[PDB]
């Protein structure tokens, strides 16, 4: 049921189009319709496709550029705002926090020794 | 039947009860939002961001410290 | 004149331009920027200023500055009004426009200092232009990813100052006509100062001592003239009353950040007191919110 | 050394942070033809960020690309394996070979009417392109060369570049569907020639990847502007064999694309026909089937 | 804990602004 309740929605397109190109003349009255076929085919011998032109085509191409740009921007947003990569970036920067603070404590330890060495002055 | 007719005084008390309930409902909602896990992760992350910038800034500016203090030691 | 087609420098863009003598009629430049260039009149001008030399800032100072200027240009549909060549503050607003893109950016440069002068010849012709920027030659290429450009020769090579008066009178001209809202103001010219040097103190004096009083915004955290305006701004009380201890701290950062002499520092301090008289028309953006609030607070203040 | 034999090693070294500042640097005077043969290398070298390095450099990927440039790019035994070589032999046998077999463009095109199937007579099989195959082996310049590199990446299954050619270009809804059915299709002939089934595993994975990308480009474009998404789904794809996105998605049998709300209310519109009625359907129209005079009291459209 | 870090680092940084004042004041003497 989980497949078939959209498989019929897919099978709408085959259903829509097979009638739409089928001879819209009556099914048991085509006696007159085949006759309309062979007549029109030989008489003209002697005698969904919107078919847009370059104005709209340019107003559709630049639309799709906004759609594909904003898509690839938006994908990056869910990756950089959902919890998994939030933990990843916070843990990795705390990695670097432990090295930068390491610098700060040991370097200011020698700065406290330099303040006492400046007490050997005034 | 269930349409209990009610006089003004009681109507002020049911209004007071109802306004106290709406304000406490939005209070219980905003501390559910502010103590839920995601929000804690989101704030901690942004905090860490500012921490990263500044602690690095303390590192470079102390570097200016240790150079200046050594230069002051050179003048004594 | 014609169109500049960039090879290299990231995404390919076409930034059409013209060559201008530095004393042209700005009214015909307005006819130019409404008809031949076909630009709409905005409701905001930022005039971004700084030192002519390259510099670097703190990282999310760059992020806040990069986001805020273009986010202002999105909330107002503003015409940003820059200094042209790819140095310093103008390289930073170039990085700012590279940070979003997705606007109406105009740069005015000297033709005498742009690299590849003889390459830059045309008559209404699309010309391929290079991002080839030799460090051996002192000639500096213009900022790449803008959309409008005026290259302005004074005849000589390797000097500034010929475009400052043109920039001043052109934005004076653009502020003289009635704005599109047409209630009794021009386009609100607002002057952003990231860092800046000694001359930007006299340019913010040319901005403040002016009709209309141009709302200037200074940017803190950047350096040089901006931090000493900040030092006169936070420790100000009732305006011009500034004592001597931070005066000497300011004078040794004018003698170390600017490396001036003692009398040059005192001279520039006289100019600093003359500028610190007017504290209300300046708006001091400080780091710690973007320059959105700074530019639009100043917009309203000088909208008057 | 000079820059032409610098990048030979740098593209071989696969270090994005070496020639991003070096090899090409302000002051280096690049020769002629060295970058364009370095693209002829890079596409086969599976250079994901190095092709986009040379694009940001300003290789006009248009002017670079010629008729026998794509051919030279198809006749290379470098990179990953080519299912192409199994197909070039399947479709020539369908029409009527030593490792010197010349993979003719019209054969890559034949692979097209075989794999994509259906009608879909490709642009290469055009009699107009057929006279330039004999007259050449700005004619070599392609109108929209982006598209012929899109087909190039997916034939030799090079998927890192196949996602790279997709954010750059036009008709991206079309290219998503064309690549999706074509890669479901290689997932058919890989089982037909009985190659190592792990290619069929990841070409069903790549076919479904282009499959989600067609959908999240569709529901993306829906909430931007719904009426203009109609024009995208229906217009003639002159480059992709004079076709339509719904005509190629049912060709793909990509069920989920057909079922997303946007294509469904398009289909309902066509089922309603030139009618606005859209209310108590079935019963009102069946009164018009039998009785003529009810017809006048229906809301049509134009 | 990171709440306490923010307040603390804030105090260390403004303090080290006061330390720049001390360093320049000692530079005035020499």
């Amino acid at each position: 049921k989980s497949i078939s309740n959209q498989v019929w929605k897919f099978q709408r397109y085959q259903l829509i189009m097979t009638f739409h190109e089928r001879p819209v003349l009556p099914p048991p009255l085509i006696i007159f319709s085949h006759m309309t076929m062979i007549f029109q085919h030989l008489c003209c011998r002697w005698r969904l496709k919107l078919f847009i032109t370059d104005d709209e085509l340019k107003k559709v191409h630049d639309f799709e550029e906004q759609c594909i740009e904003e898509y690839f921007r938006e994908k990056d947003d869910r990756f950089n705002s959902s919890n998994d990569e939030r933990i990843r970036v916070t843990s990795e920067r705390v990695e670097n926090m432990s090295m930068r603070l390491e610098e700060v404590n040991e370097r200011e330890h020698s700065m406290k020794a330099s303040l006492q060495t400046v007490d050997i002055r005034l | 039947g269930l349409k209990l007719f009610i006089t003004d005084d009681e109507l002020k008390k049911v209004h007071d009860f109802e306004e106290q309930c709406i304000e406490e409902y939005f209070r219980e909602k905003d501390d559910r939002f502010n103590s839920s896990n995601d929000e804690r992760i989101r704030v901690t992350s942004e905090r860490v961001e500012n921490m990263s910038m500044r602690l690095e800034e303390v590192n470079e500016r102390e570097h200016s410290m240790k150079a200046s203090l050594q230069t002051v030691d050179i003048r004594l | 004149f014609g169109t500049i087609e960039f090879q290299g420098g990231g995404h390919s863009n076409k930034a059409m331009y013209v060559r201008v003598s530095f004393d042209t009629k700005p009214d015909l430049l307005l006819h130019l920027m409404t008809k031949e260039w076909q630009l709409e009149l905005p409701k905001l001008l930022i005039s971004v200023h700084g030192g002519l030399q390259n510099f670097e800032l703190q990282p999310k100072l760059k992020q806040v500055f990069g986001k805020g200027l273009i986010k202002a240009a999105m909330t107002t549909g503003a015409w940003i009004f820059t200094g042209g060549v790819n140095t310093g503050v103008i390289r930073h607003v170039g990085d700012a426009l590279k940070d979003h893109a997705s606007i109406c950016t105009i740069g005015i440069a000297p033709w005498g200092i742009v690299e590849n002068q003889e390459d830059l010849i045309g008559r209404d012709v699309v010309r391929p232009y290079q991002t080839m920027s030799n460090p051996m030659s002192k000639l500096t290429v213009l900022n790449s990813m803008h959309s409008h450009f005026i290259l302005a020769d004074n005849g000589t090579t390797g000097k500034y100052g010929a475009e400052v008066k043109l920039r001043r009178q052109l934005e004076k001209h653009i502020s003289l006509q009635k704005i599109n809202t047409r209630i009794g103001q021009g386009v609100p010219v607002v002057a952003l100062i990231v860092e800046g040097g000694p001359n930007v103190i006299s340019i913010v004096l040319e901005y403040l001592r002016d009709t209309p009083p141009v709302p200037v915004v200074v940017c803190d955290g950047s350096g040089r003239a901006s931090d000493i305006l900040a030092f006169g701004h936070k420790y100000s009380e009732e305006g011009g009353l500034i004592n001597e201890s931070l005066r000497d701290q300011l004078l040794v950062t004018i003698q170390k950040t600017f490396t001036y002499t003692r009398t040059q520092a005192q001279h520039l301090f006289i100019i600093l007191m003359e500028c610190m008289k007017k504290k209300e028309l300046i708006t001091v953006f400080r780091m710690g919110q973007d320059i959105d609030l700074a530019i639009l607070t100043a917009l309203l203040k000088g909208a008057n | 050394a000079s820059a032409p034999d610098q990048l030979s090693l740098a593209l071989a070294w696969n270090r994005v942070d070496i020639a991003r500042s070096q090899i090409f640097i302000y002051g280096q005077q690049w020769p002629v033809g060295s970058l364009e043969q370095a693209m002829l290398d890079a596409l086969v070298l599976d250079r994901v960020d190095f092709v986009k390095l040379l694009i940001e450099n300003g290789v006009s990927m248009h002017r670079f690309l010629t008729i026998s440039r794509l051919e030279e790019l198809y006749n290379t035994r470098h990179g990953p394996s080519n299912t192409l070589y199994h197909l070039v032999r399947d479709v020539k046998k369908r029409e009527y070979l030593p490792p010197d077999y010349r993979i003719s463009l019209i054969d890559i095109g034949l692979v097209i009417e075989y794999l994509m199937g259906g009608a879909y007579r490709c642009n290469y099989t055009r009699k107009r392109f057929r006279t330039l195959y004999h007259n050449l082996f700005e004619i070599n310049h392609f109108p929209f060369p982006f598209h012929e590199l899109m087909v190039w990446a997916v034939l030799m299954k090079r998927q890192k570049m196949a996602l790279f050619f997709w954010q750059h270009g036009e008709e991206a809804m079309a290219k998503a569907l064309v690549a999706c059915k074509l890669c479901k299709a290689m997932a058919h002939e890989a089982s037909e020639n009985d190659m190592v089934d792990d290619i069929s595993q990841e070409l069903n994975h790549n076919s479904r990847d282009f499959g989600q990308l067609a959908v999240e480009l569709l529901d993306q474009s829906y909430k931007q502007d719904e009426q203009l998404a109609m024009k995208l789904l229906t217009y003639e794809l002159k480059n992709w064999s004079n076709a339509t996105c719904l005509q190629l998605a049912v060709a793909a049998k990509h069920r989920d694309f057909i079922a997303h709300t946007c294509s469904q209310m398009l289909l309902t519109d066509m089922w309603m026909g030139r009618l606005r009625m859209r209310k108590n359907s079935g019963l009102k129209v069946i009164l018009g089937i039998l009785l003529p005079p009810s017809i006048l009291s229906l809301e049509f459209k134009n």
Side-chain angles (χ1 to χ4, degrees), chain A residues 1-13 15-20 22-31 33-38 40-44 48-54 56-57 60-77 79-84 86-101 104-105 107 113, chain B residues 1-45 47-59 61 64-67, chain C residues 1-4 6-10 12-13 15-22 24 26 28-32 34 36-37 39 41-52 54-55 59 61-62 64-66 68-90 92-94 96-97 99-117 119 121-124 126-133 135 137 139-149 151-164 166-177 179 181 183-205 207-208 210-230 232 234-236 239-240 242-243 245-248 251-254 258-259 261 263 265 267-272 275 278-288 291-299 301-303, chain D residues 1-6 8-14 16 18-23 27-28 30-31 33-43 45 49 51-55 57-62 64-68 71 73-76 78-81 83-86 88-92 98-99 103-106 109 111-115 117-125 128-133 140-159 161-185 187-191 193-194 199-273 275-277 280-290 292-298 300-301:
Chain A
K1 184 202 61 43
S2 66
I3 190 167
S4 296
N5 64 7
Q6 294 82 17
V7 175
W8 181 65
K9 299 203 260 286
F10 162 72
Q11 273 293 10
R12 304 171 31 61
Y13 174 76
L15 183 63
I16 302 299
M17 183 278 288
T18 300
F19 293 99
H20 187 273
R22 164 81 60 61
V24 194
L25 316 186
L29 277 105
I30 29 193
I31 298 89
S33 322
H34 295 121
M35 191 205 208
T36 314
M37 181 156 136
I38 298 304
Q40 183 62 255
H41 173 126
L42 182 43
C43 182
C44 183
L48 183 63
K49 294 212 321 193
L50 301 205
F51 287 146
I52 62 170
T53 188
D54 63 358
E56 171 74 276
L57 171 43
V60 159
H61 280 203
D62 63 358
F63 180 48
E64 168 179 62
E65 298 321 333
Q66 312 161 324
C67 306
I68 190 167
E69 171 286 310
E70 191 277 331
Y71 177 64
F72 278 108
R73 194 221 51 51
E74 161 56 4
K75 172 142 40 180
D76 291 331
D77 189 358
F79 164 55
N80 292 64
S81 86
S82 66
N83 290 319
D84 50 340
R86 294 273 192 56
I87 301 299
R88 183 180 63 83
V89 65
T90 296
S91 70
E92 201 296 310
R93 294 161 100 241
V94 165
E95 293 177 350
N96 284 77
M97 291 315 198
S98 179
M99 294 300 293
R100 300 265 68 61
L101 182 57
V104 176
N105 189 359
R107 185 182 295 276
Chain B
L2 281 193
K3 199 186 320 277
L4 171 153
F5 316 111
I6 194 66
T7 188
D8 41 20
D9 289 345
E10 297 317 291
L11 187 153
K12 277 75 70 177
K13 277 75 70 177
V14 292
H15 283 181
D16 291 331
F17 184 44
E18 172 177 37
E19 61 86 20
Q20 174 274 344
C21 294
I22 62 170
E23 61 86 20
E24 193 266 350
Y25 163 65
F26 291 96
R27 167 192 326 268
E28 153 58 21
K29 182 174 73 175
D30 63 358
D31 63 358
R32 291 183 291 113
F33 190 26
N34 290 318
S35 66
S36 66
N37 288 3
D38 44 5
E39 211 55 31
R40 294 182 184 272
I41 282 330
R42 181 177 181 170
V43 65
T44 288
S45 179
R47 294 183 181 277
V48 165
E49 290 281 318
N50 296 115
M51 295 296 172
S52 200
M53 293 177 70
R54 294 183 181 277
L55 161 73
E56 190 276 331
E57 191 277 332
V58 175
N59 214 42
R61 194 162 172 211
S64 179
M65 281 315 169
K66 164 53 42 183
Chain C
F1 50 90
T3 300
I4 290 163
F6 284 97
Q7 284 84 28
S12 178
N13 64 7
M16 61 66 58
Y17 77 109
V18 70
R19 183 177 178 179
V20 175
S21 179
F22 83 108
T24 44
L28 180 50
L29 309 171
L30 180 68
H31 193 317
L32 183 63
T34 56
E36 292 83 3
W37 299 56
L39 292 167
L41 183 63
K43 68 168 193 313
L44 182 62
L45 277 296
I46 193 66
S47 179
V48 298
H49 284 260
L52 61 83
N54 290 318
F55 53 92
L61 276 295
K62 294 181 177 67
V64 160
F65 180 75
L69 188 153
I70 193 66
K71 180 67 173 66
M74 295 298 102
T75 51
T76 68
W79 265 12
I80 62 170
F81 182 76
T82 75
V85 309
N86 198 22
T87 52
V89 54
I90 297 297
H92 281 309
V93 65
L97 162 73
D99 187 59
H100 302 56
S102 294
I103 308 92
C104 295
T105 79
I106 309 102
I108 61 170
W111 171 267
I113 62 170
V114 65
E115 183 178 1
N116 303 318
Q117 294 179 356
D119 169 47
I121 299 302
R123 328 285 305 275
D124 269 332
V126 177
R127 158 196 63 230
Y129 187 60
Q130 51 259 39
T131 59
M132 181 45 257
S133 48
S137 71
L139 283 72
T140 300
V141 301
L142 72 165
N143 190 272
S144 45
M145 81 305 298
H146 294 269
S147 64
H148 297 82
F149 264 119
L151 283 72
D153 201 13
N154 73 322
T156 62
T157 59
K159 282 183 288 307
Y160 286 85
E163 69 275 16
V164 187
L166 178 61
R167 182 164 165 183
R168 194 74 205 85
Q169 65 182 357
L170 188 153
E171 65 183 1
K172 273 174 194 292
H173 171 49
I174 301 306
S175 66
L176 294 174
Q177 70 275 16
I179 190 167
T181 62
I183 191 167
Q185 65 182 357
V187 294
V189 71
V190 65
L192 177 63
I193 297 89
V194 175
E195 184 178 1
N199 188 31
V200 307
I201 303 293
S202 66
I203 306 171
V204 66
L205 176 62
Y207 281 146
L208 285 192
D210 180 42
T211 300
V214 166
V216 298
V217 64
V218 298
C219 182
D220 215 342
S222 51
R224 285 179 76 230
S226 87
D227 291 331
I228 62 170
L229 294 174
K234 322 172 305 308
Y235 293 98
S236 178
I242 297 169
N243 59 84
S245 62
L246 73 165
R247 152 168 45 240
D248 287 325
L251 287 186
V252 298
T253 73
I254 291 154
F258 192 89
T259 78
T261 62
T263 187
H267 181 74
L268 193 151
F269 192 86
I270 291 156
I271 308 301
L272 167 76
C275 281
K278 289 271 200 64
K279 213 185 104 172
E280 69 275 16
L281 277 296
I282 63 170
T283 61
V284 179
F285 166 74
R286 294 203 54 271
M287 161 43 52
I291 62 170
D292 290 330
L293 62 83
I295 190 167
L296 294 174
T297 284
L299 197 162
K301 291 177 71 68
Chain D
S2 179
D5 62 358
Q6 272 175 356
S8 66
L9 319 168
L11 277 296
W13 284 335
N14 289 284
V16 70
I18 62 170
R20 184 42 81 171
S21 67
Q22 185 64 60
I23 303 301
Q28 162 68 35
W30 261 117
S34 66
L35 283 72
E36 293 82 4
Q37 73 84 30
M39 294 298 291
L40 189 159
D41 291 331
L43 277 296
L45 288 189
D49 43 3
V51 173
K52 94 182 301 303
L53 187 153
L54 294 174
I55 301 299
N57 189 359
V59 176
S60 179
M61 73 291 291
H62 174 33
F64 155 77
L65 192 43
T66 62
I67 290 165
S68 66
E71 182 65 11
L73 282 153
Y74 286 127
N75 296 295
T76 300
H78 292 171
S81 66
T83 48
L84 180 40
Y85 211 72
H86 327 137
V88 77
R89 183 180 63 83
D90 291 331
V91 298
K92 165 33 52 173
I103 326 283
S104 179
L105 295 174
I106 63 170
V111 151
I112 285 167
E113 301 67 33
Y114 182 76
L115 277 296
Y120 204 86
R121 183 178 182 270
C122 65
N123 44 296
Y124 298 166
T125 41
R128 194 231 51 61
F129 186 85
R130 298 294 296 163
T131 187
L132 271 293
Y133 204 51
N140 281 254
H141 294 89
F142 291 166
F144 324 110
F146 292 160
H147 283 338
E148 293 83 3
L149 294 174
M150 171 65 78
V151 65
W152 180 108
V154 65
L155 294 174
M156 294 182 286
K157 74 192 161 163
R158 295 141 161 281
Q159 183 62 75
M161 294 182 286
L163 188 147
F164 160 70
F165 284 118
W166 185 68
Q167 339 109 351
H168 295 89
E170 69 275 15
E171 300 180 349
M173 181 75 48
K175 307 202 255 174
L177 294 174
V178 174
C180 182
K181 155 92 161 63
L182 213 59
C183 183
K184 194 53 61 73
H188 172 67
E189 198 68 33
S191 66
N193 295 28
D194 263 7
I199 62 170
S200 302
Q201 293 179 356
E202 51 76 23
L203 294 174
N204 164 286
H205 295 346
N206 294 17
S207 184
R208 65 178 177 87
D209 292 340
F210 280 98
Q212 293 84 17
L213 294 174
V215 176
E216 315 106 350
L217 180 48
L218 183 63
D219 63 358
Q220 184 62 255
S221 66
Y222 182 76
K223 64 182 181 293
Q224 272 94 60
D225 187 24
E226 311 76 340
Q227 63 84 30
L228 183 62
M230 301 315 78
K231 280 73 176 175
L232 161 63
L233 294 174
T234 58
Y235 83 102
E236 182 185 336
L237 311 193
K238 277 74 69 177
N239 297 295
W240 306 101
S241 296
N242 294 17
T244 296
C245 314
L246 277 296
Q247 303 254 0
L248 294 174
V250 65
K253 294 153 301 313
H254 194 268
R255 204 291 291 281
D256 203 329
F257 179 92
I258 301 299
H260 169 270
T261 318
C262 180
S263 43
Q264 287 285 309
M265 51 65 58
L266 183 63
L267 276 188
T268 318
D269 185 28
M270 295 298 102
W271 183 257
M272 281 315 327
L275 282 72
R276 203 173 322 190
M277 161 265 268
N280 189 359
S281 64
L283 282 72
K284 298 293 183 182
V285 65
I286 208 74
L287 294 174
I289 301 299
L290 311 173
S294 66
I295 293 193
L296 277 296
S297 159
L298 282 72
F300 284 64
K301 64 182 181 293

